[PDB]
Design an enzyme around this catalytic site. Structure first.
Site, PDB file in Angstrom:
ATOM      1  N   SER A 230       0.820  -1.209   0.000  1.00  0.00           N
ATOM      2  CA  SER A 230       0.000   0.000   0.000  1.00  0.00           C
ATOM      3  C   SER A 230       0.856   1.263   0.000  1.00  0.00           C
ATOM      4  CB  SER A 230      -0.966   0.006   1.190  1.00  0.00           C
ATOM      5  OG  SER A 230      -1.710   1.211   1.238  1.00  0.00           O
ATOM      6  N   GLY A 232      -0.728   4.175   0.095  1.00  0.00           N
ATOM      7  CA  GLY A 232      -1.683   5.141   0.641  1.00  0.00           C
ATOM      8  C   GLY A 232      -2.761   5.458  -0.378  1.00  0.00           C
ATOM      9  N   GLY A 235      -3.078   4.378  -4.422  1.00  0.00           N
ATOM     10  CA  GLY A 235      -3.204   2.946  -4.695  1.00  0.00           C
ATOM     11  C   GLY A 235      -2.175   2.023  -4.070  1.00  0.00           C
ATOM     12  N   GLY A 261      -6.853  -2.896   6.340  1.00  0.00           N
ATOM     13  CA  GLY A 261      -5.872  -3.981   6.208  1.00  0.00           C
ATOM     14  C   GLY A 261      -6.508  -5.359   6.347  1.00  0.00           C
ATOM     15  N   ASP A 262      -7.384  -5.507   7.342  1.00  0.00           N
ATOM     16  CA  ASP A 262      -8.169  -6.728   7.554  1.00  0.00           C
ATOM     17  C   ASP A 262      -9.106  -7.026   6.376  1.00  0.00           C
ATOM     18  OD1 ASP A 262      -6.956  -7.090  10.055  1.00  0.00           O
ATOM     19  OD2 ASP A 262      -8.556  -6.044  11.145  1.00  0.00           O
TER      20      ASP A 262
END
Lengths: 318, 312
Positions: A230, A232, A235, A261-262
């Site tokens: 990532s 941010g 993309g 994130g999960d």
């Protein structure tokens, strides 16, 4: 529709779940009594946020890890209510609490170390995990290790998976991740963001494409099929085998990024299970991540906003 | 039937977080966490169990946190006969950080009318196996305001004394009802709050205040004066309790210890001097302790003997 008898299922691992207590407060009066009426108490842990997102996406999923005591029973009650299947290993210790105090613009958290896992329990869970593996096609591993466990415990688990040819999506960080990266038994997917990546290498951060290419191709990351990074709002950058991708995502209005994130992990692991192509895997991972960020809830996605964002994601072989 | 019943209608699973610093808006990691069966009536119970008094704890519990409470009591070999509810027993949090006690107290579950009447029947059958009842704390959400009056009605019918440790609008509802506690223990500030009267430390104002129609038909009225000691009214007799000097480390649950002391004395038919000293010795013992609702009974005898009791 018949209940499936094969292995077409995701296993999530949450080795240190918690009963999360949320206290919304108009003010936190320090050194005084703060009376509260509306407390939310939930089954917490990153792996459980992954499980919840996968159930929303409609993927078959089974949650495991370690639970114990009345708080482990509370965790079980919560998943049962949510019609979430689980096969946790019972320990002599008690599952932890974690406190989040929502006050005056702030999240004041108190995080409990949690139970100690003894030797018989550590070994028995491995036998349990091995049994569960027979009915599973992908495994998602989230969060750090509970106390009492050998620091090679994920490597042990990954080794069981690799023997059976079951892909592993690993979401852990710091020394925990680094321990896995240095062992011979490799996860299929890892997903550090851009700062985490360079910190792992002990190098300065660099957003240049060529520099990210060298970073992910370093010895530390050898043998991991997917690295999904990532950057941010701009993309992501991904490496699949030796193919590189720039994932470009649209501008979004975020509310709470915790659990994105999960949600990404759920998207990756869903795409893995289903053998989706690279573009589709990447677009799903980033959509789920973006949808969650747009919600006030942690590890929750609005599926009626999925297709419009997915159509806005652009993937480039770079 | 030689046994005390304690009532904890609104218990909690108390979580205690000792921190070096409480960092707000940040993660505070903790390792040494204490989780206990909480509530005033449970403190009374624990103190009564220390003294070696036959005791049985009751009240409401629900769900997994209710089972945690039962388990903690089982481990302490404390007997309990709670009534289970559909809701969850609450948590209460205390963060101890750099000299401060920052508390988060949950309201807790709502009790429905079937549960309220259910507990009444359960309580009545318990009442056949006890000789004194200690009631501590306020009513959980959902219960009719008359609920303590209902409980005390049952005790009065059965000739079982009630030691009542409750406050404010909760106590006032009881005082105005016909069925009376045997013992109340409002402190001096609280006493005058009940009468909507200005605080007067004067002995005569105190004798008058304690004799006002609000407190009619109450056998023992025991009023804490702070370090000074106590002022009490037993029927028509007035006592003053002269107590020695101690260093207060934690004065929370000192009332609980005093309730345990008042209740033990009632159980064992002790005399009026012996009751007031014992009430006061346990309260001071707890004030010396770090543990809420805990007494060191090694210092009991010496502190008890340094107490004088004067009829005034």
């Amino acid at each position: 529709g018949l209940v499936p008898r094969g292995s077409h299922m995701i296993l999530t691992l949450t080795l240190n779940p918690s009963v999360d207590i949320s206290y919304p407060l108009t003010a936190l009066k320090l050194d005084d009594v703060n009376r509260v009426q509306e407390v939310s108490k939930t089954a917490g842990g990153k792996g459980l946020n992954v499980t919840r997102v996968l159930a929303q996406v409609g993927e078959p999923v089974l949650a495991s890890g370690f639970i114990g005591g009345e708080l482990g029973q509370f965790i079980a009650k919560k998943l049962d209510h949510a019609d979430i299947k689980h096969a946790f290993y019972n320990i002599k210790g008690e599952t932890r609490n974690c406190i989040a105090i929502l006050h005056e613009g702030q999240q004041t958290e108190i995080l409990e170390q949690g139970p100690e896992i003894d030797n018989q329990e550590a070994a028995g869970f491995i036998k349990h995990f091995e049994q569960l593996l027979e009915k599973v096609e992908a495994v998602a591993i989230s969060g750090s290790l509970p106390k009492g466990l050998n620091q090679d415990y994920y490597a042990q688990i990954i080794e069981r998976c690799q023997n059976k040819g079951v892909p592993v999506i690993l979401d852990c960080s710091g020394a925990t991740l680094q321990t896995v990266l240095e062992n011979p038994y490799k996860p299929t997917v890892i997903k550090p963001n851009i700062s985490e990546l360079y910190q792992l290498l002990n190098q300065p951060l660099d957003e240049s494409l060529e520099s990210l290419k060298q970073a992910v191709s370093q010895p530390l990351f050898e043998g991991i099929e997917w690295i999904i990074v990532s950057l941010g709002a701009q993309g992501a950058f991904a490496k699949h085998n030796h193919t590189f991708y720039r994932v470009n995502i649209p501008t979004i209005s975020v509310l709470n990024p915790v659990g994105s994130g999960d949600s990404t992990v759920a998207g990756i692991t869903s795409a893995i299970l289903n053998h989706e192509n690279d573009h589709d895997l990447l677009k799903k991972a980033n959509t789920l991540g973006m949808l969650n960020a747009q919600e006030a809830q942690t590890g929750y996605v609005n599926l009626n906003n999925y297709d419009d964002l997915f159509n806005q994601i652009e993937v480039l072989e770079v």
